[PDB]
Design a protein around this ligand. Structure first.
Ligand SMILES: O=C(Nc1ccccc1)N[C@H]1C[C@H](C(=O)O)Nc2cc(Cl)cc(Cl)c21
Lengths: 354, 51, 406, 49
């Protein structure tokens, strides 16, 4: 079966609206949608419930979303993925917003963009407003070598200031501050301390503009006070994505994957019986058909993922920290293209010539 | 041959005899091969014999 | 404050030995011994982790591997489960690059060096025999990936011997006959090979098929290769490395519990030891004692275990450990030196080298052939289609002397 | 103080002061500016007293 999990304090009862939209079409094998939600439940409870329900209701595919209790939950099924050989889809939650690479002996791609995708969108913003030079500093957050290599390669086809990795050397490193635009690839917890040290050294208001990726702030509402009254960030999750729309996207993905499956050689994912013993390990040796479950379409666009878990050309938006310590949708992104619906943001002359 | 980006994000390769030297095919070049900075970072040049 | 400690092991008798260890630790805080065995189907273990231990108040855990050939799936379930809280843990056995990096797993410390670092010995193995040219063979697994990483980084930092070619390949290969062909016709004559066990035949039986082990040859592999081939198809004279701990969890227990004891004495000064959250279900509470416990276990130097000076590297494995410079005697095994931490310590025996000569062969032969290439350019290059005989016709210059043509 | 010391651009640095304050100023110098090979300090007679 094809199940869905919606643990978390939300409108789950309402979100079951998508049940009829599933019930009418876009399901060759008509699935058995069924919610098993929970409270702020612990990892072990999560595991036992997941496999117990997948065993009970005869489930052969699943997708869930929850409150951002911890990114570690994304890791926690990476183990069970190959342990039972079933597609997984983390969606709609910061819990499912982190990356989890190299576990790829099994399924569980994700949604949202990649490090590379968001980074290239940062560069797109940089050009579309002609911000010529840029600096960058970061720490051991996942993707440091990836980020530095990507940015060092995409410049051989810029006006950089310098790349810096940090660990009395902090001031002697911050003294190289030379760019008119400053970047950082981090998260909010450390962002408090780093904006603190920034006020300690670097400018904050008119004179510098701070741009950061999606998973620096995590959620969309909290705000440590050391952030300047302006932040160009980019994301998609909690500003346009409706939970019914998201679960519709998911059930569509799994149904069209099932279509490709039953068409190529007509094999259904065999029902894994028990999450307990080696007698269930009999099916565990059966064939695997993961790859070809990735070039399938519905709602028009294609949903091709690379071998690691990120879709191609996501639909993206750019927000800015306004004066009321809030974010506002200021930039559209579609089909590898940018739209900046707001000009330079508050020696100010306006010239004219022919 | 010159440094050219390949696979659209993957690598930088030499599209010709220079590469054939770096690739392991060749072992020495004798031809009107030019000298500049860009190539000098992966080859070793004798003094020039014909300006 | 009675800090109970939990363990998982593969031999119950040595779990009783661990109870002896916790009694000796009581000889020295306040401890309480608890432990659990292991079972197949790691999901059951991911059950038992909190069904037994996390149900209590734990500030350090013990983990060791079974003899089953999983060797990678054995430490991960407990790893993930505890890591949800960032709980420092102590691994005792197979040291593949499971948590070689902090990315997936966060605060684990081990007592056995991972098969990566054995590169470095080779490094100084070069600085003993003055060899400065080298071939390298690696399969594109994570193990070999890190292998190439560490080796190339150390060698570039040595700027001396410079690498020559990083030949990558795939595990599931029946024949690498194509690659060794281009390989064994290059300059140097020394070879390093780090891959899975059964690959050795795939190499070795293919090497002797190309006679790639006769003479003017030197080899160097990893312990898995040594075992799997020195039983099966080892071409004699090949050299490898051997580790002292081998396969026994006993001494590891001694190396482990001592620093576990020495740790608790580092937070009996401010009383920030509030409570390890017992029971798995019930709270997402981050026991923020984790970073402190880890930062202190990263330097809790002791000399308890059978092997003196058991400490940690920035990775948390065995640091400054000891190897034995293994060697083969055409069907037999011997140690001709104990690499002691950083010391250059060989030991006396008939150190044979492939083919069986008491000389130490030079690096390269420096062939006399030189593949040359060139392009078509009339005032520098004239090309002409051959004549009917298989050459192109001779001709004289306007002065009358001949003209070369090739 | 730091936003002023950030303009440090010369290869030679001067100061017209006395020893009592010179303690604190060389302290802040180590805090920001170089001290050994890279800068040379020159001062008048009545800095050291
Ligand atoms: O321009 C080319 N090839 C090309 C051919 C068709 C269309 C466009 C370009 N080659 C150049 C570069 C290369 C050199 O080492 O200078 N060979 C070489 C040798 C000589 Cl003698 C003079 C020149 Cl310009 C060249």
């Amino acid at each position: 079966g094809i199940a869905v999990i919606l643990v978390g304090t939300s409108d789950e009862v309402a979100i079951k609206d998508a049940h009829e939209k599933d019930d009418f079409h876009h399901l060759s094998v008509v699935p058995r949608v069924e919610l098993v939600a929970m409270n702020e439940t612990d990892p072990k409870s999560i595991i036992t419930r997941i496999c117990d329900l997948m065993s009970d209701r005869k489930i052969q595919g699943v997708v869930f979303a929850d409150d951002t209790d911890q990114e570690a939950i994304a890791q926690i099924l990476d183990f069970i993925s190959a342990q039972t050989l079933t597609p997984i889809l983390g969606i709609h939650g910061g819990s499912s917003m982190i990356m989890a690479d190299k576990d790829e002996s099994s399924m569980f791609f994700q949604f949202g963009p990649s490090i590379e995708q968001q980074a290239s969108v940062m560069l797109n913003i940089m050009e579309e407003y002609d911000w010529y030079i840029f600096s960058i500093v970061t720490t051991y957050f996942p993707g440091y070598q990836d980020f530095v290599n990507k940015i060092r390669s995409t410049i051989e086809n810029w006006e950089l200031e310098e790349v810096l990795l940090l660990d009395s050397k902090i001031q002697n490193q911050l003294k190289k501050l030379q760019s008119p635009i400053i970047l950082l690839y981090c998260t909010k917890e450390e962002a408090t301390y780093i904006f603190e040290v920034a006020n300690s050294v670097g400018l904050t208001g008119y004179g510098y503009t701070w741009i950061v990726p999606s998973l620096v702030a995590g959620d969309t509402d909290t705000v440590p006070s050391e952030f300047p009254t302006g932040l160009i960030s980019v994301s998609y999750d909690e500003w346009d994505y409706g939970l019914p729309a998201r679960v519709r996207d998911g059930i569509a993905i799994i149904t069209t994957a099932a279509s490709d499956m039953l068409s190529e050689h007509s094999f259904i994912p065999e029902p894994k019986s028990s999450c307990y013993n080696t007698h269930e390990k009999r099916i565990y040796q059966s064939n695997m058909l993961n790859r070809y479950l990735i070039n399938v379409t519905f709602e028009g666009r294609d949903l091709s993922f690379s071998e690691d878990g990120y879709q191609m050309h996501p639909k993206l938006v750019i927000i800015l920290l306004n004066k009321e310590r809030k974010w506002e949708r200021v930039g559209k992104w579609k089909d590898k293209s940018l739209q900046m619906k707001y000009y330079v943001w508050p020696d100010h002359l306006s010239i004219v010539t022919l | 041959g010159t440094q050219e980006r390949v696979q659209n994000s993957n690598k930088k390769e030499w599209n010709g005899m220079m590469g054939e030297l770096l690739s392991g095919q060749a072992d020495m070049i004798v031809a009107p091969l030019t000298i500049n900075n860009e190539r000098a970072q992966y080859i070793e040049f004798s003094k020039p014999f014909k300006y | 404050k009675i800090v109970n400690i939990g363990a998982v092991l593969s031999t119950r008798k040595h779990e009783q030995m661990f109870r002896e260890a916790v009694n000796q630790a009581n000889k020295r805080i306040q401890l309480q011994a608890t432990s659990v065995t292991h079972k197949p189907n790691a999901i059951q273990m991911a059950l038992s982790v909190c069904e037994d231990l996390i149900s209590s108040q734990v500030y350090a855990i013990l983990v060791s591997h079974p003899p089953t050939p999983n060797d990678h799936f054995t430490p991960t379930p407990v790893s993930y489960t505890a890591g949800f809280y960032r709980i420092p843990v102590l691994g005792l056995t197979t040291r593949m690059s499971i948590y070689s990096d902090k990315s997936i797993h966060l605060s684990f410390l081990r007592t056995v060096p991972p098969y990566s670092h054995q590169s470095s010995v080779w490094f100084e193995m070069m600085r003993v025999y003055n060899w400065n040219h080298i071939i390298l063979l690696v399969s594109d697994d994570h193990e070999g990936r890190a292998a190439q990483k560490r080796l190339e980084t150390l060698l570039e930092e040595r700027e001396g011997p410079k690498a020559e070619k990083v030949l990558q390949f795939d595990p599931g290969t029946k024949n690498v006959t194509a690659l060794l062909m281009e390989a064994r016709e290059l300059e140097a004559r020394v070879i390093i090979l780090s891959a899975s066990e059964d690959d050795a035949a795939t190499v070795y039986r293919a090497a002797a098929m190309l006679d790639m082990t006769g003479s003017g040859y030197v080899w160097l592999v990893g312990e898995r290769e040594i075992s799997g081939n020195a039983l099966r198809y080892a071409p004699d004279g090949i050299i490898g490395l051997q580790l002292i701990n081998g396969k026994n969890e006993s001494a590891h227990i001694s190396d482990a519990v001592g620093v576990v004891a020495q740790a608790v004495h580092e937070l009996l000064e401010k009383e920030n030891i509030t409570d390890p959250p017992r029971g798995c279900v019930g709270n997402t509470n981050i026991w923020k004692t984790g970073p402190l416990f880890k930062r202190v276990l990263m330097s809790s130097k002791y000399a308890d275990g059978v092997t003196g000076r058991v400490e940690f590297n920035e990775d948390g494995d065995r640091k400054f450990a000891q190897y034995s410079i293994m060697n083969l005697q055409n069907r037999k095994l011997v140690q001709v030196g104990i690499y002691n931490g950083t010391h250059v310590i060989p030991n006396d025996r008939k150190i044979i080298w492939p083919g069986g000569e008491t000389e130490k062969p030079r690096g390269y032969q420096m062939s006399t052939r030189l593949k040359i290439v060139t392009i078509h350019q009339e005032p520098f290059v004239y090309v002409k289609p051959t004549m009917s005989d298989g050459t192109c016709k001779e001709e004289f210059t306007v002065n009358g002397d001949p003209v070369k043509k090739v």
